[PDB]
Design a protein around this ligand. Structure first.
Ligand SMILES: [Mg+2]
Ligand SMILES: [Mg+2]
Ligand code: NA
Ligand code: NA
Ligand code: NA
Ligand code: NA
Length: 278
DNA sequence: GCTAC
DNA sequence: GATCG
DNA sequence: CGATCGGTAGC
């Protein structure tokens, strides 16, 4: 039999006893246009998050499906696309409330050409959504990835030093062996090289940040957010945990639950959802 | 598989 | 990137 | 371990 997983019910209450006031949802959608045809928007309508983060939109602003302008709950929409590479990468952030402040990229030209990061600053925290560069098949871009990890870390430490930080999206690492079905077989595969894993480790420590889902569920295995379309990986739960909500430690008294919407379809990733009591 | 996830 | 030599 | 086949979106 296969090692399967069932996300526990939503716990909508903080340790202090306080109820959740903010629901954030994050989803690598493997193409916004395709995802919307596969009815990803109707799932979002039902989860009704206050904030929705989208990675790999692979879509410029002038080709956004009109369904997005039929979202009364998420009226403030920000999109970033690559400078020159069409139909590649791309990130979006949708919000009920208008952020105090929004900006794009991590303040470093070399790393700001592929539309990977949006920063939205609110009252009590700063939200960053990101689609981290893949090291690629053959690890052809592993060296650049290392360069990214450093620049990204420095940048996030900067934000965090001024306000509590929430970082979500596809960080493109399975941190520990427990974060993917087949650890030994992928030790030289993008997403689970020693360099990427140690990069994620150094990110948690240096910023600093806490991995919300693993903070709440330290020993819960077989919890994944990505399955390759190939070889029926998903039905056999052969997956990776590549999508995170990383929190500033000052926010952990506000954390109610960090979820994995395993059953939501439309992409090779599934959505994740964060509950905070603010 | 054209590339790149 | 799961799979099989 | 390493070569191979092989889901998919969008160009
Ligand atoms: Mg793909
Ligand atoms: Mg992908
Ligand atoms: Na399980
Ligand atoms: Na398949
Ligand atoms: Na390629
Ligand atoms: Na086998």
């Amino acid at each position: 039999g296969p090692a399967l997983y069932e996300d526990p019910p939503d716990q909508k209450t903080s340790p202090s006893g306080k109820p959740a006031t903010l629901k954030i949802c994050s989803w690598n959608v493997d193409g916004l246009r395709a995802w919307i045809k596969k009815k990803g928007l109707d799932w979002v309508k039902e989860e009704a998050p206050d904030i929705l983060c989208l990675q790999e939109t692979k879509c410029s602003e002038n080709k956004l499906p009109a369904e997005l302008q039929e979202l009364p709950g998420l009226s403030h929409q920000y999109w970033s696309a690559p400078s020159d590479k069409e139909g590649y990468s791309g990130v979006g952030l949708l919000s009920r409330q208008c952020p105090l402040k929004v900006s794009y990229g991590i303040g470093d030209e070399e790393h700001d050409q592929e539309g990977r990061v949006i920063v939205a600053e609110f009252d009590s925290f700063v939200l960053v959504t990101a689609y981290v560069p893949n090291a690629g098949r053959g690890l052809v871009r592993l060296e650049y990835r290392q360069r990214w990890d450093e620049a990204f870390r420095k940048f996030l430490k900067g934000l965090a030093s001024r306000k509590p930080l929430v970082l979500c999206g596809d960080l493109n690492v399975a941190h520990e062996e427990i974060d993917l079905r087949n650890p030994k077989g992928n030790k030289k595969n993008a997403g689970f090289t020693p360099q990427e894993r140690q990069g994620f480790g150094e990110l948690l420590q240096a910023v600093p940040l806490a991995d919300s889902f693993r903070h709440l569920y330290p020993n819960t295995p077989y919890a994944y957010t990505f399955w390759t379309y190939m070889m029926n990986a998903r039905s056999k739960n052969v997956g990776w945990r590549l999508d995170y909500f990383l929190l500033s430690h000052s926010l952990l008294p506000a954390l109610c639950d960090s979820k994995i919407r395993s059953k939501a379809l439309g992409s090779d990733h599934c959505p994740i959802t964060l509950y905070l009591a603010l």
